Amino acid sequence: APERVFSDLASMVAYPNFQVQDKITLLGSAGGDFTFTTTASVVDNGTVFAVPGGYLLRKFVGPAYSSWFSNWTGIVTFMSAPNRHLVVDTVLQATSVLNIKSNSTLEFTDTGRILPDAAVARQVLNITGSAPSVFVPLAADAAAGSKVITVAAGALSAVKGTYLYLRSNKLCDGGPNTYGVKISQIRKVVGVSTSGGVTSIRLDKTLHYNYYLSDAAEVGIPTMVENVTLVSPYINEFGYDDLNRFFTIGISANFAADLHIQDGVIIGNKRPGASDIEGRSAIKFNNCVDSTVKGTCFYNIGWYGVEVLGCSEDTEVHDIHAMDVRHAISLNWQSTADGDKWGEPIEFLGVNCEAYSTTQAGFDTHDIGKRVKFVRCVSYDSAAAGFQARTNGVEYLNCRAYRAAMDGFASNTGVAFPIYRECLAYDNVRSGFNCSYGGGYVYDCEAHGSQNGVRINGGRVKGGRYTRNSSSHIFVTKDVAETAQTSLEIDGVSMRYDGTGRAVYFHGTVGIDPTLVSMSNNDMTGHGLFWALLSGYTVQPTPPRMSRNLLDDTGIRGVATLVAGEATVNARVRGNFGSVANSFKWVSEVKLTRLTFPSSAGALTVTSVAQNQDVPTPNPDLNSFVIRSSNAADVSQVAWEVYL
Amino acid sequence: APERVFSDLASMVAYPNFQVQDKITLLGSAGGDFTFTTTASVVDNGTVFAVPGGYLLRKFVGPAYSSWFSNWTGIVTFMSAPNRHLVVDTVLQATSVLNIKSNSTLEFTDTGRILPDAAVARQVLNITGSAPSVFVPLAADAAAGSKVITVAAGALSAVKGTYLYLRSNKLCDGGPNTYGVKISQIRKVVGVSTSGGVTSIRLDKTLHYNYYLSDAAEVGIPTMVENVTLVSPYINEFGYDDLNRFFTIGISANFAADLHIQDGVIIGNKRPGASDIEGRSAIKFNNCVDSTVKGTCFYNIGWYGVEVLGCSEDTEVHDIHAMDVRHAISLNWQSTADGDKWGEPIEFLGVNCEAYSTTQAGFDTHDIGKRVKFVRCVSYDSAAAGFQARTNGVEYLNCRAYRAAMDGFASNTGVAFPIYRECLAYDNVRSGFNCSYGGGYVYDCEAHGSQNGVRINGGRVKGGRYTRNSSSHIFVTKDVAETAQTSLEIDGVSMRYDGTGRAVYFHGTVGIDPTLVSMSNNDMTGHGLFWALLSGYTVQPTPPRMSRNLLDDTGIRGVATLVAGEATVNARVRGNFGSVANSFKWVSEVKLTRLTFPSSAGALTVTSVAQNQDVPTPNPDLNSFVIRSSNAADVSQVAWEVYL
Amino acid sequence: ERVFSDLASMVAYPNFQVQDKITLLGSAGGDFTFTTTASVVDNGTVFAVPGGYLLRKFVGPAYSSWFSNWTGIVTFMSAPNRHLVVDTVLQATSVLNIKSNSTLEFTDTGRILPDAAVARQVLNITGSAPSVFVPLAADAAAGSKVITVAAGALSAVKGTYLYLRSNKLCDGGPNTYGVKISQIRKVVGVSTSGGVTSIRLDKTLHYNYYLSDAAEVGIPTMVENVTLVSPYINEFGYDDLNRFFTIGISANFAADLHIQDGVIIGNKRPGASDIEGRSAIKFNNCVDSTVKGTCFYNIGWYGVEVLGCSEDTEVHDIHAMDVRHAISLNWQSTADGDKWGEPIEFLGVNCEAYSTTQAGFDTHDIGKRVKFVRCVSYDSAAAGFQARTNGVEYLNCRAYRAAMDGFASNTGVAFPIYRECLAYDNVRSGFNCSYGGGYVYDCEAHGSQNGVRINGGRVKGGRYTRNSSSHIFVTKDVAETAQTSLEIDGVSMRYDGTGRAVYFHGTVGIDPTLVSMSNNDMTGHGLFWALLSGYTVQPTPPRMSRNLLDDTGIRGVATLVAGEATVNARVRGNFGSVANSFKWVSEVKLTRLTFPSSAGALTVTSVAQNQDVPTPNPDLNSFVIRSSNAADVSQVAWEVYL
């Protein structure tokens, strides 16, 4: 006195003559210090409470806490304004969507949880801006690289620091784009200037496509939700499936800039091991810029872990863990069955992500999107592929895929040249790398334990090591005979024999011309006569160009001494001189160099290749060739080396 | 009673009855609880207020908040002592520099800003130590790799856990060091032992140079500012240019250890698009150790985004985003025009940084600095190069340069061997990689859409793939004829013909000898007789050594059958036998190997190469060569393969 | 208005009543409530007083400055769901144990100073192994999402863990102590049917759990979600107060343990010798846990020790100075009985070790899927990196000035992979993998006695310079080890005034024909590209294709005259028969440029090498192109290789 103290809220709210300078205190589960006022205030029953005469305002600096609030509704209310920092330190029971606004932070303590409504499977968190409500056209073409776009003076108000959404009817070009999605981008206004009836707006970042007037290039002002941080969000909890408690999408964002999601866990918008539900993504970024997800764990998810779509630019996914999901990460298309759509993701980075037991590819893109990179990601036990590229030129560095039901890494129909650098595939059922749909670049990669190491129709396999492939290490083939075969270069690969499949398998069945392949400097040791596998040929095909490969490691070098311009040499010289259709006619390259220089030196040649035919098993140490001189007096000492 | 409660500052400061045992409270926009005292106390009108009889001390645990201070001056006062943790939760209007001291934390809420003084363009934050006042000489020479240094006993007091500054008159050796900067290093004392009039000081990290007594090797005690953390600094704000509100240097650090800057945004110390202003770097690290910048966004900066100079050691820059700046990151030299200068950066890492529209190179070093690495950095639309290396052996991993006005990646005058690993250059005007000033190592790189893929005078181009280069993929040239051509190895490179430039271009004009190049196992498919481009030669030069390259993919392998020692084969065998100055004399390498072994077998050779001359366009499938045996009776079946 | 001037006062007042306003001034300041409900005293948040207790009122975290002594802190942290900020300098006299869902956070000022009277452990995060196991109902192969046990056999609660094990031996490396396999998994699905319960796991199984191996499973007690933010353990000057500790932060059966930044110093005297088991941070059977940015000084044992079946462990951006090993993956001694667990899936990235008494980064002989990415070692007393488990992979790592080798494997270790690694001034060698082969890809070694020591595998690419003996030394650790095929392709082994290109070790049975050298730059080594020693019979050389030996006098055009032409070029060779030498000659590639009717088959003969004194002039070496047709007058283009 002047000191008011209550032991419950019902008390504090029921007091009838609060004075604007009372010292008000509340003791209990939501306790604290309040201030009376008659100023109109938004009631949320957490920070602002209604009472006879007016309101009670909580006194505090720093963030607010969920444990202050009477109910989920109050939470929702409190978060509906921008600039709000909340710490979820209690177990919230959701009955509606929670929308986050600009410059807001939702932070979880280890105890905090948002549990979805068991009565209605719906969305949990929305971070939601909106597309511009009117567009104006560009006053002139703006090429890729432009820092400035121009509009008619007066046409729109370009406020420095805000965003713009541009679009045209030019199609997205990251990949095949079969839905014919159109181009768009989001940029920030950092400079504005009018002169001569044109406004020039300088953008933060340059344009990545041609924005032409012939394509109806326009621009408008989107309402963006910016600067949102979700710290350790915990959505749902184990045992959700016995309560039949689900949700649709966990965290859905659209038109958001600088949305950063750190750690947290998201569980169960499907039953464990259950099948997939279209659209039930854990986190969804649609038209998001400069947004990231780092270290979040996803369990038991109906659709994608992280879904990136629209003109999402500069998005990073780091260190995530996803178990029992359709795709850990997926860059998506948009169906235009119901009209026009704009945006493919541009500049996407996945780094250090782990996916287990996905029902479809572990890490995937659809058929649009530009500049996609996967770095040090790994896939385990996928029901499909470890990694699937469906847009053009996806890059993978040091990725790994184990025990995929299908392929470790794969492109798809009409996709062009993914790049795999030092990627490892282990024990995937069908193949390590399947890029027979339209070439690939397989550089310093490894594939072990599949039917075939690499399935390829054109491109390059440079370096790397292949083992334990039942059929062959490299399989030259196509997805369908209508696809084109192109040049294939196989240079510096270890494709040794280890008692399983052969080195290379040429697929005659679908129109493979072996001469379109060049094999240089590869270690094919131990395959003997069975380095190649051929099938589907009706005429013996010409073999590929083959320079200095290794086929054997014994009796592959030596010195002979000519006698009357001849010398028989026992070595592991080999060849096939038959004419079976599915086979090559070939023979060992034998490099000859003279080491003594008699006056009767003649021109050297290899003739009479003989191969031991013992039974049941032939002995290659008894193969032999003859070194013959063009001079019949030759008694040179000649060094020899056997290659393939 | 015994408690006195006020309703604003003015009242609470005036009241004269304050006694050491009152409980004191304040209502209002900076409310709290206080404790009166009469000990000395530094006023800041935040946590300490001067009053009749003594000073009121705000009592709180945790950090302080900017919202409690009356003005910028008290904030500055507050942060002027070490061990401060302040949360900027308001928009501060600066009118002086803010110095941060050791063990302090400056932290911004989404709302917090520091706006620079519109009246005076000055620096914003300083983190400033000082060089030593006096030096003592080393008792003995101390070689690179020394864990210990020695000084005369009692020369200086080395306190364990503090730092030392070492220097000599040896010149920095990282690069050309044209200003003649001298070596210096900073080390932390972790062990001390005195014996026989000689103190041995153990360092945390070893020495990276040789500190000799003949070079005046000496050592003193710098005053360091250590363990400072800036969390999410927001300096200036969009629209600054319309208020003519700027600043010079955003965050300046000298003699700092463990300065960590986390996210935040720094805007406009220049107008948008405007020209550069010397020295207006957003962040500057001079003589800093183990300091970092991570995730900060830079807009409209007159100088460098992050400027690193001095003997700054072990600095890392991660995930930055720099738009409209001179250099996103620059390691600097020091001008010695007005005196001796010490220190080059040692151990630098830039990773996953993004630069847009820089007025000069996106990522730059000057001509000093050791161990400089760029990992997965990207430059867009530079006015100069994407990447500029002016110190020796700068290493680039998986970096990307798009659409630079000049070269994607380049070194410079007297700069030696940068190393490019799996770096990609798209649509840079002049070249992808320009390392003609003094050699390069270009490993598995890619350059598309330039005049020349790579300009190089010596080094290696190993693997990689080059497309859409109007002049040539590899251009063997020099910056100036005085510069020395060294050996160049071009191995396994894809330089296919795509309707633009040639494969290799040899620059006779600046003294290029083509026999100092070896081309081995490259894919030159489709260039026909035009794989080389020569100019500036007065005399037909000898060609480089060429081993097993590919020039066509049709008519390049078959079997022929001799008849009376001969056979004419139709194949894309090729050559130039002319003697024109700007061309080579050359011919295909045709590999021949026998497949049937008659008694008339002789030595094989190629002769009579003939090349169809149809008009208007020649048809190389009517080209031909002859296989002839030294034995006129030979009827062997000879396999053949055509290489370059 | 119950207001006290200090502590003692607030704890002597007999009158506290159910609902008052209690306030404390002074250094421990705060507001309190009264109650008689049992509470656990800690003289920080809970106080004992005549009549019952006083509870401090607060939201958010608790502060060390609130506490009377180290003991209450320990009490406070001994319950789960605690958040404490160490904003003071705490003086420890016991071990502090941290429990599930807790966070210990230090301000720039906070410290935990170890007991100077007793060297002990500082922080413990410890769970415990399962008290009982039940056997698996059926075999569970690698890749299984599920395991089965008899219905009723154990209660699998969703969200909790399982510890599985079998008598199968760990298979990551040589595993000489014969450690057995185990793994910890989270239950995410449970279903019972036909007397058999099927448990679904978060992650799949990485071994074969067979019944023939007594595969069994049990319910460990884990400590989960612990975060240590900037821990400061000890302080410089500790050695003058003789203040140490044993293990700084020791964890066992922890899940999601994260240590961020911080400093740990002095469980050993500066520069002093090592003390067994005194690791700064130790992770034993921990899952999904990490250490990022922490600094280590003066550590008796290892910086970060990872042992047991720790799976999915990562260490980033640490700096370790004067430690045994900055990171070590360990084995478990079985001398005193059976042991379970090798690390699986370990990532080291961007880590820096300075001045280690032993390897900078090491594993022992168990461990699967181990990766070091961009780590660097400076001045190790031993190796920079030592791999003792099979297939360790290094990406872009660097070793400077190690007393022995920049990178090495060890006895019975198989094929480490080095990708774009850099070795500078390591005394003995850059890469030493002569124990069981190696894959050395685009690596670089400068300033050792030998660039690469290797018995088998591959050197592809890379560049080697300033190696006194040779760039590549083909050798074994011991003659009993097998030599396998070695490929040396595309390597730059240029002569620069020091060593030779390749050194074949006859002394330990190296047969050079098991080596192939293709497309290498061996420019400048002249007749001395190879070094041999220990041979008693001239051995046959390795297969060699198109390498480069000189860069002058190596391409021309010659004109035949009556079937012959004497060419001056840098053709070379040895035709001698000294045991320690090869019999070899340059590869001279011939192509015809004019096609006279008299054209015949070409050959190289009459190789001659200038013998001037003191120093020979190789520009006067020569060879002869000869045609099989004596009339031949062709122009012949020639190129000289090795």
Author numbering:
A (entry chain C), B (entry chain B): 8 to 651
C (entry chain A): 10 to 651
The authors write:
Many bacteriophages depolymerize the CPS of their host bacteria through their tailspike proteins (TSPs). We demonstrate here that the K1 lyase from the NTUH-K2044-K1-1 bacteriophage is a polysaccharide depolymerase that cleaves the CPS into oligosaccharides of 1–3 repeating trisaccharide units with the retention of the pyruvylation and O-acetylation. The structures revealed a compact, rod-like, trimeric molecule with an overall length of ~ 128 Å and a diameter of ~ 86 Å at its widest part. The structures not only exhibit typical features of bacteriophage TSPs, such as the central β-helix and the C-terminal β-sandwich domains, but also contain unusual features, such as an N-terminal collagen-like trimerization fold and a striking protruding domain from the β-helix.
